[PDB]
Amino acid sequence: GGEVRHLKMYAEKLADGQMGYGFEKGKASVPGPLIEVNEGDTLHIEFTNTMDVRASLHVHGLDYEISSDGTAMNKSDVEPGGTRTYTWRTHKPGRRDDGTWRPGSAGYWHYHDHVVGTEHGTGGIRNGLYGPVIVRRKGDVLPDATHTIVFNDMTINNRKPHTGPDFEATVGDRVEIVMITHGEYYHTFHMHGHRWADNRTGILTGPDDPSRVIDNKITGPADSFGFQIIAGEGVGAGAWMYHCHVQSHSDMGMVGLFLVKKPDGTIPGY
Template sequence: ATAEPAGKTTRKTAGEPGEVRRITLYVDKFPDGQMGYGLEPGKPTIPGPLIEMIEGETLEIELVNNTDVTASLHVHGVDYETSSDGTRMNDSVVQPGGRYVYTWRTHAPITRADGTIAPGSAGYWHYHDHVVGTDHGTGGILLGLYGPLVVRRTGDTLPDKTFTVVFNDMKTNNLTTAPDFTAKLGERVEFIVIAHGNLFHTFHIHGHRWADNRTGTLTNPDDQSRIIDTKTTGPAESFGFQIIAGE
């Protein structure tokens, strides 16, 4: 990451991509039968951990399945071979007690031969299981096997903190209240919003607005991006944005 020169408000930005990184992700069960991904064995979370990439890099993810059911890892928004699809159709799944390496690749925007632009991978995406419960993995998603992925472009402004919000079908009886999202005045806050289940939802933040584009921020005074404070999202969709707390 880089920062602006002295004398200006410090702004951290995404650096240059590396070539290949490798992480290990674990699938574990909670005592109540729910499931989650985690960066350490026996420490799953719902949603799963935030995974960040920079356009142009490759990420190899070794998925270790510590449960008694077959599980997998499927991703949205980035490039991969069919062997990293995470479905039964091509046997890219992980048996109980097993492990498997998934490879995700990203690329910057490309100018086609006809002069049009092919979009890059930068954006707010998500990953999830695609096999628990049914061949489509709807059981795994209901149990908690999902998480956020952010692909940043070199030079993108980095947030001070990130919150992930997931809409999903679930039982709420006897559950604790949802967590509060807290930030200090002036902090740059990033929201990643993911929708699962069968319903459409409307996401809204009181007292704040953002640009309806890739980052949620205006790039210059003449940026014509629509400014919104509410966004509707449906099953399998995801989006994200940054705001300044209290602005």
């Protein structure tokens, strides 16, 4: 509100047929790196496609002009080997001249390829071309740690079945989760031991906020949400599961651990 940030991104081929984004060449990951801005910021992303097929960057939520939408149709993708600057903007909330209220960009969002495999990025998303974006409102509560969980088709973060990811915290830590879904299937995200408000920030504003407090939520492709929890609050340390609650999904491997440790670094049991 409002810095003009410059940033580079690269799409790259990875082991085992995966593809991923990174801020630095040679350092792509699945999921892609978190991009975090404040409302009012502008972001110029100089994106380079280092792969042998056309590729792009498409973002949810943020204000971009049509030349930055990442589609073939608007000639907004990038040749093998090529480079292009995308521009994303964000805006603060406020009253319009007509007296109505402009929302503001703040929320939990995401970016992904829109052109690998099909004109809807089906091959790209499947291979790992997705990552999270957070836009903070002035005065939002900031966490001690942020974790990204993406349910992509039947995987978490494109991992093999039953291999996490796992995430560590300590009783009392303010932990932020960004939850994105991609692919063909619906899922239900569930965490043991912890709960959040079903609203923008995942936190209740005060006693007048009527939002449902939940610990389970249905999600479908390209849905994103986020929340903050206090690790172990009222429940203590432990190896706390998170998983998809669709029964065959969890049985086939969509399960991870939210390892909450005591101040001395132990977990009771595990």
